[PDB]
Symmetry: D2
Subunit: 266 residues, 4 copies
């Protein structure tokens, strides 16, 4: 058991195709006791019933100030007073279709970009602010990322939200360090979630479906060890490695679980 006895909060489960669902499943397989958060709760309760073990499901809208202000208290009620968190998983991402997809880069209104940056980047800090007081020293906060160091088609303002998230992670590390807590991001390669498969199937047109297929083919080609977009397990394992006590001198950083694709040009 890699995470034996650890109490880990896991956000971002929407379906059993979510990266967070696999992070939760692998953490439970490694002995961690989970607390799950979710923004449609009826679907969430049905989805999480497919996890190896039972886990309390708390409601969390990262834009709702009341949900965040009460979060530490609601978590303590779920795990019991006298207990604290050893880990936190931020697997939350959102960008309206005006800022991500087929809409031209310049045509995204700032109100939609601002909402995307609030959920995808600012929420990493507001979740750390809420949960650090109830975290044990030696704990770990892990956020999900997708390498934004180079521009690419369709991802557009979500790439901008990820460049902001990377900057936020380095400042969250400064704050988290005071609690003896690490803060890191996992830059994952593309994973065929329900929305990603729908895009490949033509939900966003044949040009967006071709650009995503080209990105996926190129990812597997550049990755020295290959990249299977239908397998979320290598990413979930990497998040568990950062949640464990086996990367204890790593903080404010990014671990690439992308098959090594970002290290190769061709």
């Amino acid at each position: 058991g890699l995470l034996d006895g650890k109490r880990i909060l896991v956000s971002g489960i929407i379906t059993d195709s979510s990266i967070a669902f696999h992070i939760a499943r692998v953490a439970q397989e490694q002995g961690a006791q989970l607390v799950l958060t979710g923004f449609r709760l009826r679907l969430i309760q049905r989805i999480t019933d497919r996890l190896p073990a039972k886990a309390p499901l708390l409601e969390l809208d990262v834009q709702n100030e009341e949900h965040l202000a009460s979060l530490a208290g609601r978590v303590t009620e779920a795990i019991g007073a006298g207990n604290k968190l050893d880990g936190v998983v931020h697997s939350i991402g959102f960008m309206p279709q005006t800022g991500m997809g087929i809409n031209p880069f310049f045509d995204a209104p700032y109100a939609d970009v601002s909402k995307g940056i609030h959920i995808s980047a600012y929420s990493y800090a507001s979740m750390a602010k809420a949960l650090l007081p109830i975290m044990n020293p030696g704990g770990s906060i892990v956020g999900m990322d997708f390498d934004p160091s180079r521009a690419m088609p369709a991802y557009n303002w979500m790439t901008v939200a990820k460049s902001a998230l990377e900057s936020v992670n380095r400042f969250v590390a400064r704050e988290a360090g005071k609690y003896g807590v690490r803060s890191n991001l996992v830059a994952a390669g593309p994973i065929r979630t329900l929305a990603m498969s729908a895009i490949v199937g033509g939900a966003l047109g044949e040009e967006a479906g071709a650009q995503i297929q080209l990105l996926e083919e190129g990812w597997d080609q550049r990755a020295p060890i290959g990249w299977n977009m239908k397998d979320a397990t290598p990413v979930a394992k990497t998040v568990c490695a950062l949640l464990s006590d086996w990367l204890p001198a790593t903080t404010g950083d990014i671990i690439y679980a992308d098959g090594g694709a970002h290290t190769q040009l061709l």
Copy 2:
């Protein structure tokens, strides 16, 4: 004359200590014909009267949708129909004191961070969207930046705004390339503007004044050729080099005018 005959729009002049004032002064010394934009216009008209040559001053609030929608037309009226821009200088930056300065990183409300990101990063794209239709092929768009790849004290959410601006610049390059136009950022070292000198004088307390002095001393120490925070000229010259035809195969990039400080650990 490095910029002989070129028509360059220059935003961001507030006082004669502004980086944009020195960019405008050096561009005029190199033969460029300027169009200046400004967000308190009475002070601006008095300040720009100290420039080597006359230049029309247009009003531009980057958050005002009407100011941006009319900008290309207002610029054409200032330089004359039949004429286009060869360059655009974005020297605009803002972050309320809740997100930059002495306020703790986690205590910045999202509304203030969102406003800071709108002016400091999103506006680089909205200015490029407005001005690219009236730009000549071979033109150049230059934005001002401050290396955000590593976290630091006090700069806090403005560092996050700069990481977002760097990502925006790479997408603006994709769009600008269609017009044969380059888009680059200049990452400058610290420059003693009126606000920066006030901070060193204790406007933000003795701890912020010590952290800024430590940053400035360390910048000059790490810079192999030294760094004079009271001299804006090396930065203004670098912006002019990118505006010229002497860096024609460089776009989506960052040029460091920081004395080389970012290339040295100590």
Copy 3:
């Protein structure tokens, strides 16, 4: 047992203060079966006698073409016919004092620089060439590194050799990927080995000694979680995480075990 059942070759043990000694000790505490290499085998035998468990000790001078030609055969005789290695640890670094220390950067003769790059950078590829034919799919090659992205005092040509090692690692990942094997480096913060503590005491003079002390002190300050030069365990555990099956999608990459110092400016 994090590395239960795994056969791991560990090079670089010279004294009980070497990072390789701590890597070997933690790898054995986690159930791995080791093969040790040495370049003085009688004195290395006494050092490796202090490890929790016994392990076959093979002679390997990375500059000796014959030692590398026979290496795979000598490893198979030590681990059993039909068996393969699951992990390889390169913890070998060398730079004559003409290229590292108080000697001016320009005063390093190329013959010394060449020997330093041969042992520190080329040997990573020649060890992978000799051991990849005898490694299992899912295997892991880990090399030791220090961040050379920014120049610094005294390290001089050792930094250049580390920049070369980073590039070699990315090409070793291309080759290793054909075998299902990962190749990664661990960029550690400064560790007080027998030589580093002597250099601080005055072995290289008061000016270089002050520069090294200032350089090493800045690590603890920049690191959000702190940094203890006297504790090699956080570095050793990070190596064992890369050798395990918990980072299965990371190759051609660098993991920073530096307390997060490289992510902070000050």
Copy 4:
């Protein structure tokens, strides 16, 4: 005249297709007074005869310690006693075909790799060591580079030598800064020199020829402003901008003259 009155040493001219030839031609078109070096001086004399203006041609084999010892004295005899250089251009790269091309990465003997790093990386420092005592404050040393941050087919050990050159540049900046001199590299996209066009035609085989063609074709596609392998002028102008007084605060750095390709994923 961008370089009017400046004395600039230019190494690396072999044929009229060399980047050094175009750098020398553009430098002379901009008013600079040149000093050329060569390693075959009678055949280089005929090539340099095609430049706009005459220039003294000195012999320089970067591996010859005697050529480097006498270099400063031979440059002063050519430019006049009391005079100093304002610029130095290192455009020298070499890697035996065992370390670059179709030979497997692991099959490169170290003797060949060592010679390649000596000419491509070490020679940048040994040229700066010999010429810094005879350079003016405000001077500029420019080396030629290709982006080696990501591995790629065929370039193999030449990429490793470029990673080493990037590190050497940052240390040469520390030393050069003591003289008021800058040191920078220009990372160019692929340029069709006599060798590159022969490799595409089939000199290295159909598999490597296809890989090189695919690699070089991806540059034009990724570059927001496009990329013409047959045009060396954009690279030559970028070098002249670094040699001028228009980038006076940039040192230890890399300027990318690659059409912005390195800033885009696809």
